[PDB]
RNA sequence: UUUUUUUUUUUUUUUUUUUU
RNA sequence: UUUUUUUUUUUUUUUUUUUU
RNA sequence: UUUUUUUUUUUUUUUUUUUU
RNA sequence: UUUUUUUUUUUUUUUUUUUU
């Protein structure tokens, strides 16, 4: 089956490639300029705007009688990079919404109303944009609405998304994204700035239910087994302030605790195009199905492949303010961060894989990715993840457990007077947990969080990777060369 | 009658012996290598595969047009131990299905279609394999299908069996086996991975009925008198989630509560062969009818008899992973565990009987019993259960009861003005229990379980054996030397 | 507002007229032959086939590889009446689906995907076809699927409709239609011949829910206040056989009981065209907005207007079998029956309005309305409803009620020793009804139905019309001449 | 589908033919002697004995220690016709049960344990034997056990069958067969000469139930709609004497009343062989699939085909006692009677179809069909049903009914003071019948039977056939020549 | 102390809480 | 390893704790 | 007086109670 | 037009109402 999954993935990407090629020709993009990651972003952006069904309802509500509003409902704009003489600039490409719909309906089928097929791939792109926004600008103008601070922001990977995508992206969003959503849903229940809703998810659960259930379900799919999932089960029976308080403490606990939260790679569509043209310029050996997965070393193959000759803008100006500034390899880091979701990964790990030193925001420099008045083109530094690694989704070891099977209430076939390993107390706990015991779970689980943090603050002594874990060479997808990132100071 | 039962048992075993001798010659097994318990297991295994009527229906369904599938439907393989120069290895013995059928039809009669005659003895062997699997590997690859956790696994003695055997083995299976089966039957009613069925059992009950009734009947044959059997009677009138909830709490209660659940011994067929050859090498004094019972001290006679000179493999490698490892006497323990069903018996009791210290899984080491690339032979440590004991099937004392006959509503022949021991309340309870009272029995019996556990948590003060119970010497089947296993720490 | 409702109705009909004129020219229909009611039906029929989204999904499923299936997916056929020398026949008109879509998208807008706009008007037409089928042939070939008998059929006005229309037509369908639907939905839950679904209805209820709720809602919108609506509220908590039993008894009760069920008129589109051409031939005085309502005397104005000169076929042959047969005025009756939904109205009432004797099926004769091999044209008998009447939707008087406001538990400001009209018993009933009392409502409401029928069997003494009710002349829309249909035998 | 039904039927018969050919060779039957209908019967007889699972259980019970009983359990005997010099005699053919099982398991598959496949075809043969017995000897030695008189015997078509077949043959057995069975089941409940049982029938009803339900179900499948089926529904709630009384009166009523009871044809297997050899001797034109149905004119095709040259014994002796005796054409009548189930058909109808006068038992002569000491062969009279007819299963017209749809409790949309066709009384009857009204149904239905008989005694005026019904020529399967059997005296 | 069924899979992977 | 919703807004502003 | 769904079938057979 | 059970007996006696 996984080979056929790589094939369906390869077709999915080939569709995105065919759309993008058509989009590039549609706005008049020069052949070399098609490679541009900024152009990837611009097309992907335009597709979000067109596909924003909610915002289209609202647009209609204010579209009014004005013939200028009505004509601009037919036009679609795309700010794109165009180059000449090694210099580069923006152009305002324009095509009608039916032109964009034609390409989309042609490649994905007339039933774009299969919200699953278009929304899956567009969720992945919107997530990549959300990633890049998150590394860029700490979401300030959105958090002035979404009302929460920097630590909450760190756990809120993917929370730059338009609301419609948040259901689609369930697995990969950082726990804070869901938490912030719930906290803001309680504000919406005061403010009326919202419409409440009901949904269903085939292949997962045919349950037919609201954001309340959906969020709680996603929260259960994320939280740590035992106490935190037990708080997740309690959640419908917390009061609203108890929900906010619980959300806060769980969110804080999630700053340490790393239960199942899903990584993903999303390279830009122009990098997928770059992979196609690379395969072409390699004369019939690099095969996209070999790269066609949302997981595993195939992702590092694809990124380092893009690291041969892919192209992007350099503005002389900065996403910065002081006189200290730094090079295109920092853009290359930013791209990598956005592509693999590295924003809360270990910089040391990354420093070894990228095989160059890593950084914090006080050090990070980049451009805006938005097509320029004037600037210059640049191409990729070779092989950049000169070491790779195996991906993953949770903490190395959950907690120090019970006895595995023995030391329970002993059975006795033989008629012999006996001691026993009497353990009725933990047996009654197992009954209490499987019967769904609920009494003062708020305080009880607050305490359990406090002491779990302490236990973890011991467990750190070995709590470090899946136990084969090292930064192997690109000559060593074979995992032959196990080596550590750093000793310390 | 019991003497004639030992005779019919001895004939039953002699048939198994004749089959095994023929099987040993059929695959070309060396005379000494016939003794091998691994060879016992391999023949018994092959017989299951051949006799798996359900899986033969399914095999036919996928057998298709392929001449390689059709030829391998005629071949039967047997991986067996063969030895040379004190070293040992596997050989792939091969015989046609008709060769195996000839031996079977010859010794048990042409009507192997007497599913009772073949299935009884093969159920006992399949149960022994299920026992050995259970001690080996905590049934992981089966429980990924059967969906339940370690405590449930402990109560599920015999649940490694193919489905067809589970009806046959009704008495001896651990309660969890039945429970897990019911819970998975409810999943099958969703999933369609099953065919539902109807059966009848002569000498027991001519009722003609489904897994629902069969399971409930077996469950009634196991559960504790009063509340738990009353829940057993209610069971058809629980809703499906109530059934799952009830099953869970009853299963938990069964971790403490020990109502009637049936022990058995099954020594390997090669150990029965070893008993024959031992009798032979003893020149006309050890008699198999003296050993021919599924119960009583005759079982310890047979096992310790096997403990003279029986032989089995030693691989240098391990069913283990860390650098800590330990000897063939641990295999000897494993064999004993599998033979007598000791997996939830008291280790202290066993430690005194085996007259050596006993262990939990963190300490237990063994080999795979599967014929090797390379290895060495070893023979038994002498007399190993140097103490024995009397077997049994239930808790020593059910509960503190009523008055035995007095303190009921008094009769009065004599015309005399009188007080009375007025007891109409418990009289109305006896009427309610014999009329089958049903109203909120779920919650009522949940509560009764809660308080029964508490009562038992008092009753532990003496709840220990049938009152004559001690670990007497092998010189003392006469029960002359009553002595306790341990005082404590 | 009602004047503007007549205007929106007039535009709605003018659209249907423009569609029909275009359809008539599209299949090549002769100018006089455009008037033909059979041609109305044929166009309306073709529009159903084209608009049958469900059956188009199924058509695609079996359309296969065959180039003959694919070409006939592009063709659309229409069997239409064509006349010459006073004789008439069929012709197979043909146009491409895009030709039909052009006319429709031109007149109703490109967004025919506004399922409301097209489906409203087409529901009314499909209902008229369902009416005509019902009077024709007692739905035999459909009831061989829908599994219910002649009395059920009488209450099932509109149940010839394709499923998609049944939601649209909610108000006007006879209660049996809904009932039969529910009973067949329970069969579909066994048989799997269906896909279950969810819908929402703006301006009525934003609830978002299945056929179960939809049907129960429509059933509540129909059933008699008090007991029958209380059974309607219980309905989700009846078991499936209880639902069938309840449905049966409610359906039987509905044979007597006449709570709110909605009349409608639907004249043929060719009769609306006839109204246009009549207005034209009258030189600028008959105005369609004057006729533009689904209710009120404007309907009799329109029908009698059609009664001037409208034209239709006479076949010499019959929807009949014996040698007894009868004239075009019987077609005129059939048309009227289909147009006003008279199939369960009083024949005596109708006999006075049509001002000629009325009939039962043993007497009713008509043709098939399906274009012929050979035949002759005929035109309308003048003024035909020479008396009219006021329309309506429920029984004249619900039941003999309580006291209207007095005889409740008396208040007392003044400090005076007093008797009281003590009525705590009916006060507790009002509490029980407003709290939603549910206990044995099945038997209780069965009994209430039994005794309500008896009460009604008394109440018949005056249970006859809205109290102004008589068959006034066409010279007397002014209701000046109150007169009774019949005295009796 | 019916063509494929004729094909599956043709394969079913070809299997019976292949079995019979093998059986004929197995007992050493001469090539011409294979045609013999007596040989058909003898093989069919032997197959019943072998397949009598119940009687094989009983045989084992008395088989004892005797080596003569044990050897005759392996032997199977077949008394067969053998001919020489135009004379004929018996021979005792012998083959082992495994020889018979080989032919059967070879042609029908090893799983003869598919009781459906073997039992269907053998039920049809056993029914034919039961038919021939019934015409022969009025079942005297069986009715000395089954305790009922000549009129009951006439309605008991197929009641010579062994019990096991009676479930299989459900449709075609005369109502008396079921009735007699029920009456004798009540005697078995006293006498203990029986084991009671439970069964299930796929494609019909998955209900899992006893002879009580099975019989009542078959009785419901037979009885007249309305009163007699209503008595059928009551039946579980009649007392035992009420059941006997009801059975008697229903049985008497069935002497007049002809509700749905199923005809069948079963020609002898040697006549099917004769059809094969006829096709062969016709050089490649008569095709068995053309004849392969349990219904329709294909049956008369097959019988008249057999009427060319098929052969059977003539003994000079008689199934008779007086000096009056008559020819082989009377055997030909007997064969026809047995083949088509004519025993209670109209002799006049049959006289016209067979195109020769018909008879009652005082006139009927035949032989025993049991192979002789001495005798002579004879062959068929040509074309014998020189007229044919269309088959059928019920009375021509059930009763004079209600109004078909009109004259129910009138609805009123229009607000007009009105009379009504008030019919609440029959409406309450329809409610009583659909609610299952039960009070004194015994006497009520006794009365309904009395008056229904009177009504029928009027209705006889036209109660005669399906209305196209006549004895058309064999040149006129085209039904072109409608003509009546007799005028009268 | 006693008496029969059969359409979701086998001839390996670690010291382990949930569909890898 | 698998499968769908939609009425609070976008085509810029700094090294920053709260509605500027 | 007001406002949207879609996977069991169509371009004929009699005066009729149940899967012809 | 469609789909499985099994513990009261067989390889002969007349033109006849009940256990000869």
From TrEMBL, chains A, B, C, D:
SUPFAM superfamilies in the cross-refs: flu NP-like (SSF161003)
Any GO MF annotation of the entry: structural molecule activity
Keywords assigned: Capsid protein, Helical capsid protein, Host nucleus, Host-virus interaction, Ribonucleoprotein, RNA-binding, Viral nucleoprotein, Viral penetration into host nucleus, Virion, Virus entry into host cell
A Pfam family that the UniProt record links to this protein: Flu_NP
UniProt keyword Repeat present: no
GO biological process, one term: viral penetration into host nucleus
Cellular component GO terms held in the UniProt record: helical viral capsid; host cell; ribonucleoprotein complex; viral nucleocapsid
Record protein name field: Nucleoprotein
Organism of derivation: Influenza D virus (D/swine/Oklahoma/1334/2011)
């Amino acid at each position: 089956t996984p080979e056929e999954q790589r094939a369906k993935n390869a077709k999915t990407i080939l569709e995105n490639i065919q759309i993008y090629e058509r989009m590039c020709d549609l706005f008049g993009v020069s052949e070399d300029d098609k490679l541009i990651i900024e152009n990837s972003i611009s097309i992907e952006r335009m597709i979000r705007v067109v596909t924003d069904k909610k915002y289209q309802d609202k647009k209609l509500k204010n579209a009014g009688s004005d013939p200028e509003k009505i004509a601009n409902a037919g036009k679609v704009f795309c700010r794109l990079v165009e180059s000449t003489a090694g210099k580069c600039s923006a152009r305002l490409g324009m095509a009608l919404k039916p032109n964009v719909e034609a390409v989309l309906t042609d490649v994905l089928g007339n039933e774009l109303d299969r919200a699953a097929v278009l929304g899956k791939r567009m969720g992945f792109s919107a997530m990549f944009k959300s990633n890049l926004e998150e590394v860029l600008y700490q979401r300030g103008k959105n958090q002035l609405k979404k009302r929460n601070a920097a630590e909450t922001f760190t756990l809120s990977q993917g929370a730059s998304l338009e609301a419609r995508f948040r259901p689609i992206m369930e697995k990969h969003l950082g726990v804070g994204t869901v938490v912030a959503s719930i906290k803001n849903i309680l504000a919406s229940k005061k403010n009326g700035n919202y419409r409440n809703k009901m949904v269903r998810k085939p292949g997962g659960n045919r349950e037919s239910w609201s954001p309340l259930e959906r969020e709680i379900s996603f929260l259960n799919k994320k939280l740590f087994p035992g106490p935190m999932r037990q708080l997740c089960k309690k959640f419908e029976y917390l009061n609203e302030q108890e929900k906010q308080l619980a959300l806060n403490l769980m969110l804080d606990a999630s700053l340490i605790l790393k239960p199942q939260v899903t990584h993903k790679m999303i390279m830009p569509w122009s990098m997928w195009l770059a992979v196609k043209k690379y395969a072409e310029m390699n004369k019939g050996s690099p095969s996209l199905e070999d790269l066609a997965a949302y997981s595993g070393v195939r992702a590092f193959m694809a990124f380092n492949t893009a690291c041969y000759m892919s192209k992007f803008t350099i503005g002389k100006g900065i996403v910065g303010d002081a006189e200290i500034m730094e090079n295109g390899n920092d853009k290359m880091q930013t791209l990598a961060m956005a592509c693999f979701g590295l924003a809360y990964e270990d910089t040391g790990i990354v420093a070894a894989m990228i095989s160059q030193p890593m950084k914090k925001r006080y050090q990070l420099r980049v451009g805006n990715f938005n097509p320029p008045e004037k600037g210059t083109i640049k191409g990729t530094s070779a092989g950049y993840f000169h070491k790779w690694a195996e991906f993953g989704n949770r903490l190395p070891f959950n907690s120090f457990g019970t006895g595995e099977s023995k030391q329970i209430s002993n059975s006795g076939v033989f008629a012999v007077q006996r001691p026993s390993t009497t353990n009725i107390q933990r047996l009654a706990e197992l009954m209490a947990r499987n019967t769904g015991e609920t009494s003062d779970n708020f305080t009880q689980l607050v305490q359990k969080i406090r002491e779990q943090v302490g236990a973890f603050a011991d467990q750190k002594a070995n709590l470090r990777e899946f136990t084969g874990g090292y930064i192997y060479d690109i000559t060593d997808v074979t995992k032959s060369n196990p080596k550590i990132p750093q000793l310390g100071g």
